[PDB]
Design a protein around this ligand. Structure first.
Ligand code: K
Ligand code: K
Ligand code: K
Ligand code: K
Ligand code: K
Ligand code: K
Ligand code: K
Ligand code: K
Ligand code: K
Ligand code: K
Ligand code: K
Ligand code: K
Ligand code: K
Ligand code: MG
Ligand code: MG
Ligand code: MG
Ligand code: MG
Ligand code: MG
Ligand code: MG
Ligand code: MG
Ligand code: MG
Ligand code: MG
Ligand code: MG
Ligand code: MG
Ligand code: MG
Ligand code: MG
Ligand code: MG
Ligand code: MG
Ligand code: MG
Ligand code: MG
Ligand code: MG
Ligand code: MG
Ligand code: MG
Ligand code: MG
Ligand code: MG
Ligand code: MG
Ligand code: MG
Ligand code: MG
Ligand code: MG
Ligand code: MG
Ligand code: MG
Ligand code: MG
Ligand code: MG
Ligand code: MG
Ligand code: MG
Ligand code: MG
Ligand code: MG
Ligand code: MG
Ligand code: MG
Ligand code: MG
Ligand code: MG
Ligand code: MG
Ligand code: MG
Ligand code: MG
Ligand code: MG
Ligand code: MG
Ligand code: MG
Ligand code: MG
Ligand code: MG
Ligand code: MG
Ligand code: MG
Ligand code: MG
Ligand code: MG
Ligand code: NA
Ligand code: NA
Ligand code: NA
Ligand code: NA
Ligand code: NA
Ligand code: NA
Ligand code: NA
Ligand code: NA
Ligand code: NA
Length: 194
RNA sequence: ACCGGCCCUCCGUGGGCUGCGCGCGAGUGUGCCUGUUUGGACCCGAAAGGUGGUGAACUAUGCCUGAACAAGGUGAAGCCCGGGGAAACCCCGGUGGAGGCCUGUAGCGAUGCUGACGUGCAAAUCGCUCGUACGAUUUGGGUAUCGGAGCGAAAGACUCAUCGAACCACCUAGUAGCUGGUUCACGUCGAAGUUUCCCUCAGGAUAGCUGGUGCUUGUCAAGAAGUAUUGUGCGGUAAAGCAAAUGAUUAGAGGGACCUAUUCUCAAACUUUAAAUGUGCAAACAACCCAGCCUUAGUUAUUUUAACAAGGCUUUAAGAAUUGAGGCACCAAGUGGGCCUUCUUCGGUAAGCGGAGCAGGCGAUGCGGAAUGAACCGCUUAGGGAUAUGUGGCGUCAAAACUUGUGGGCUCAUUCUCGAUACGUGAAAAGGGUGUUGGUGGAUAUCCACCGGCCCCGA
RNA sequence: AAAACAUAGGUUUGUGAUGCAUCCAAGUGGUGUAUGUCGCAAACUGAUUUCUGCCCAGUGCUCUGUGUCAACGUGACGAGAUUCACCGACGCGCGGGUAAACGGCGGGAGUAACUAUGACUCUCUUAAGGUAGCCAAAUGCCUCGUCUUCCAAUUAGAGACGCGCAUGAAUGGAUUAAUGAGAUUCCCUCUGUCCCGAGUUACUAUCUAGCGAAACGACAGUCAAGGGAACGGACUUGAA
RNA sequence: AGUUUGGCUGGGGCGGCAUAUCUGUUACACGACAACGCAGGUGUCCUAAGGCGAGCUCAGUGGGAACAGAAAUCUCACGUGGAACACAAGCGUAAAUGCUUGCUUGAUUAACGAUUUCCAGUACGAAUCGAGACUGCGAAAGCAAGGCCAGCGAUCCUUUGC
RNA sequence: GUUCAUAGCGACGUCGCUUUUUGAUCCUUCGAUGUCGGCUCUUCCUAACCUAGCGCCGCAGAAGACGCUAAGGGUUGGAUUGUUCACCCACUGACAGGGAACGUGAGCUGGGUUUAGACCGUCGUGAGACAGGUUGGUUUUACCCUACUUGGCUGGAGAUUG
RNA sequence: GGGUACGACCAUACUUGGCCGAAUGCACCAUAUCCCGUCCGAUUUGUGAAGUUAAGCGGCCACAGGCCUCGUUAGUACGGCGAUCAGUGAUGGCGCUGGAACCCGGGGUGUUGUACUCU
RNA sequence: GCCCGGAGUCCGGGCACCA
């Protein structure tokens, strides 16, 4: 088994990523960072809900995978499968080491790569979900259950922007009528004279 | 420039090196203290090494000549008398007294109680029990073999309570980077556990920190400053970026790979950009200008430059520093195990763990506070009065509100018992509460959602 | 005090005296030897019974005809020191012998009418590839191996099995009547070993008369918690 | 008979080399900084892979040509270095420090000149700026006394040159 | 779990407690703090096995599962093994888990571990080695202070005085 | 208002496309006896004027890219010094003080020295 | 390093060692 997560909670070391110097790294537990209807035009989902961290700490890849499974399961059961789209915005790039105990003691104690984790900051957004205005109570409950899989303190807020887009929610449909917006996939670009 | 020595060239009134050289002498004898070295070497201490002698009365083994060993059991060879048989030969009964034979005294030993005693009767003894007891048996006197040697039915056993190398005297006060000790008073000063080298890591040499003796001077300040200001240089950490190069990486879109523009998320060994704190130089007299002048084998096609000089001239508002003794030696001690802390930081799950950076401490140091504590807070110390504070306090212990205010709120806590001085984690989490007390946003003439304070469950 | 040593029995080696072993500073010096192979000196194994397999590649010991190895000799150049050339033994190399000298003595595949196993085959390789025997043995890690017997119950004992980490033949193998203050298991008898302790005796201790030490001894001697060199008699607070 | 039988070290031993040395990072934007901290190298190689002059442009991509294809050779265009520079890494470089070619021996001697790095401001190794001789390549200015920075060694003794 | 997330469980995750395991460290003790197990004896803790009283169930009864107050009382006899541990037989209401210098050697015992003798296997040329097996192997002193158990003498309120 | 030769700073000067270009000049351009060099007078070398601004070159323009400058981001991120400061912690604000970066928005698209020269 | 032997020369032997 792996050690309890209390042994890797605080950001005590330099980032230490996977590179040509650190090679024998196991694969992270989470591989997909999107659930729900990814192929949805930006106009379909106008409501966005965030969960944002309030601590400076590390979150393991197992916890991210546990949160993804729980959030998807509740939305599918309590609502339609296609009525939402969720994105995980924390990728595990920090490698953790372990010193497994022919020599004995603390001699030559540099460890071997064992797992991966994500380093988060205060005010950073961890998960983002966009949905319709009639499924907000379901989205809030699903995110509530998901955040119970993380260490530390997190808060749940509703954004003032149109879903996954940097344009204010009330002012989006004016700039859509008067064609000042160029649609590129899931985001939009403000057209300017240039 | 001159003396000695080694040289170079275009060979001259060149050139460049070297001496513990010279450059109007400073040595020498003696007294005294301190340091280095050898000697017993400040005092006491090994395990060892060598030279010459004394021991076989303990004990080991051989030899000469003497002494000793109750009482029983078993019953070998030889011999006698009877039977059986054709022979070969076989059988009974006696007698006899063999044996590194058996039971068992004396003798010679020492298995168990892991008995007694264990400052004893005794530096190995005592009580029961036990091995053997005609044999490779026990024992007196005499004699023979020893110290790197003797002897051994062999255990490194024994050689006078001494043996994996006896005893006595001497070399010998053997050497010890290691342990222990080292005897009067007051006064002036006062550290280091770091650098480089060492068969170096419990030790030295070397520089640094310190003391003594000074020298040359100055007196408001020279060759002053762990500090500013002004001017002028240096930089790639924190941050930021990936819509910029290198590396890693998620997803849609427009024309299954592919292309274009975007997009989520990153970097100690990535970077266009780029701080704060830092770091170099300058801010006047052995100096700078101005003018004229001399010299050269330097530069230049010549002047003009370069360098060394000599006689005259000038010079000590704008936030616009402020503090004050400068420089130079000689001789020598201790130290060369360090530890703690704010902040920065590497290894480790972590540690009262291991290892670094700038600074301050303890060590070497008390005093006043945190009840108690090397390092925390205050303050740092000649012997004493008066006055006032610092940290911390004013219910009693215990000096101070003889329980201060004519100031607001909040809290009720049943068996490790609510809470109450930081450092000190030197006691606590996720998650909950229609306990009570405050806010924010919505609805209606009180209802919903969310966020705090103290208390309660988790414990 | 033994399973160790010795022992009888067994095997091997040297040696015909101007010898083999060997003392010793030395000599017409000394010991086995007052002896003479049925003797003396040097090793190993350990009664009897039945046996003692294969290996001379390594190391050692030992026996026979030309590369190398020292001084001494014999010639040269040179004025001479110096130098050069040739000759030069045992030994070491070559060639034999020797294991009751020291010692050593294998892997991997396939294969028989249900499965299993493998008499059979192939392959790599050695100086030789462990034979007769014996075993979870005082030698077996795994291991308290697996089966039977002994008990109500056995990591124990005995009897079997054997790809044996790492058994094995005078580094002796296997077996043995008699013997043992040798190690282990079970049975009968017996009991204060125990269930579970009780009563009695003699000498002490205990009191007295006489006599009369030693060890040890910073100072001393009630606790709880705290902090402290992280387990206080002393310090802080409390309680006696 | 005499003497010896390394050291460091989260005890010692086995292991390893942190024992003499080079590059990046830890390292906190001057310099300096530890660990048996991380990622890697060194005891060699080269008469050319040294010196200079000249000419040229690399990696790669796209459009074209019998056999010929994803990949052979020829041609045009783009191409800030994404190639190469003996080897580890960093820095550096485009009519060049790269590639080809021509000629050469500055990889010699160099009067004890001065200096940097480690540092006691000692030595050793490496490197920087000069003076003199004789030369090499260039029309000349000029460049060169090795291959830039790692690749090595006291007293005594032996041996060679003048 | 006939359905039913939560009677009883609960994956993927995440937050803690304890010092009855073993590691990590090297602060105290090397002019010595007697090192396994058993026997004997006392006391403490609760994370409750039995005994008292209750709630709840997928509690009809009987037998049970889960939880609460509660540590007053109780918690065995044997075969094998040095064992702690382990595993069987049997009784019982029940045969709970732990601490006290891994309680307890001037209280015992000495089977094991760990000297000197000796045998075996493997290793080593050898002397010898093995956290492999085997057999044999001295357990010393209390009369001191305190603590505890019993046993006696005797003052004293300004706790000796005013 | 210009050309040529030699330059300094080295993108406000570069990259792409389009348009225009009076004269002097600069070019493209003709050819291989000789000097010289190539597989090839392509480049290079030696000798002429037959044609032409086609290209090179100069000037202007582009909701052009890039580059330069000023604002904004923002007193934000980060920092030096202090507390018997808050918080179980992770961390954070406060006092005295220093102070960024990209995106984004406005503007701009070479300056100039010596000599010989054309209008 | 010396003497050889076998292939201008690489191996196999018997000897010898003060930086
Ligand atoms: K002395
Ligand atoms: K004697
Ligand atoms: K008899
Ligand atoms: K007897
Ligand atoms: K020193
Ligand atoms: K015996
Ligand atoms: K005996
Ligand atoms: K015996
Ligand atoms: K014999
Ligand atoms: K036999
Ligand atoms: K008496
Ligand atoms: K008396
Ligand atoms: K008496
Ligand atoms: Mg655990
Ligand atoms: Mg002495
Ligand atoms: Mg000696
Ligand atoms: Mg005698
Ligand atoms: Mg007898
Ligand atoms: Mg006894
Ligand atoms: Mg007798
Ligand atoms: Mg012995
Ligand atoms: Mg002395
Ligand atoms: Mg002392
Ligand atoms: Mg003083
Ligand atoms: Mg040395
Ligand atoms: Mg950063
Ligand atoms: Mg010193
Ligand atoms: Mg000290
Ligand atoms: Mg103080
Ligand atoms: Mg008072
Ligand atoms: Mg005895
Ligand atoms: Mg026999
Ligand atoms: Mg026998
Ligand atoms: Mg042989
Ligand atoms: Mg052997
Ligand atoms: Mg054969
Ligand atoms: Mg066996
Ligand atoms: Mg056995
Ligand atoms: Mg039994
Ligand atoms: Mg058996
Ligand atoms: Mg064998
Ligand atoms: Mg044999
Ligand atoms: Mg054997
Ligand atoms: Mg007998
Ligand atoms: Mg016996
Ligand atoms: Mg106490
Ligand atoms: Mg005491
Ligand atoms: Mg710095
Ligand atoms: Mg630096
Ligand atoms: Mg060139
Ligand atoms: Mg070099
Ligand atoms: Mg020169
Ligand atoms: Mg060079
Ligand atoms: Mg002591
Ligand atoms: Mg003691
Ligand atoms: Mg004691
Ligand atoms: Mg314990
Ligand atoms: Mg104990
Ligand atoms: Mg005892
Ligand atoms: Mg005991
Ligand atoms: Mg005791
Ligand atoms: Mg034993
Ligand atoms: Mg302070
Ligand atoms: Na770390
Ligand atoms: Na007898
Ligand atoms: Na000491
Ligand atoms: Na024997
Ligand atoms: Na042989
Ligand atoms: Na066999
Ligand atoms: Na058995
Ligand atoms: Na050592
Ligand atoms: Na309880």
């Amino acid at each position: 088994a792996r050690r309890p997560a209390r042994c890797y909670r605080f950001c005590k070391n330099k980032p230490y990523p996977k590179s040509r110097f650190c090679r024998g790294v196991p694969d992270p537990r989470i591989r997909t960072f999107d659930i729900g209807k990814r192929r949805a035009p930006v106009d379909e989902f106008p409501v966005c809900v965030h969960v944002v961290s309030r601590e400076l700490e590390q979150i393991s890849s197992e916890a991210l995978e546990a949160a993804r499974i729980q959030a998807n399961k509740y939305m599918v059961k309590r609502a339609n499968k296609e009525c939402f789209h969720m994105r995980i915005r924390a990728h595990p790039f920090h490698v953790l080491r372990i010193n497994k105990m022919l020599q004995t003691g603390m001699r030559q104690s540099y460890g071997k790569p064992n797992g991966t984790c994500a380093r988060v900051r205060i005010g950073q957004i961890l998960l983002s979900m966009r949905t319709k205005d009639t499924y907000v109570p379901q989205a809030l409950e699903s995110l509530r259950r998901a955040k119970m899989k993380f260490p530390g303190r997190q808060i749940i807020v509703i954004s003032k922007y149109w879903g996954f887009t940097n344009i204010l929610r009330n002012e989006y449909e004016e700039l859509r009528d008067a064609g000042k917006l160029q649609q590129r996939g899931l985001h939009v670009k403000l057209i300017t004279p240039k």
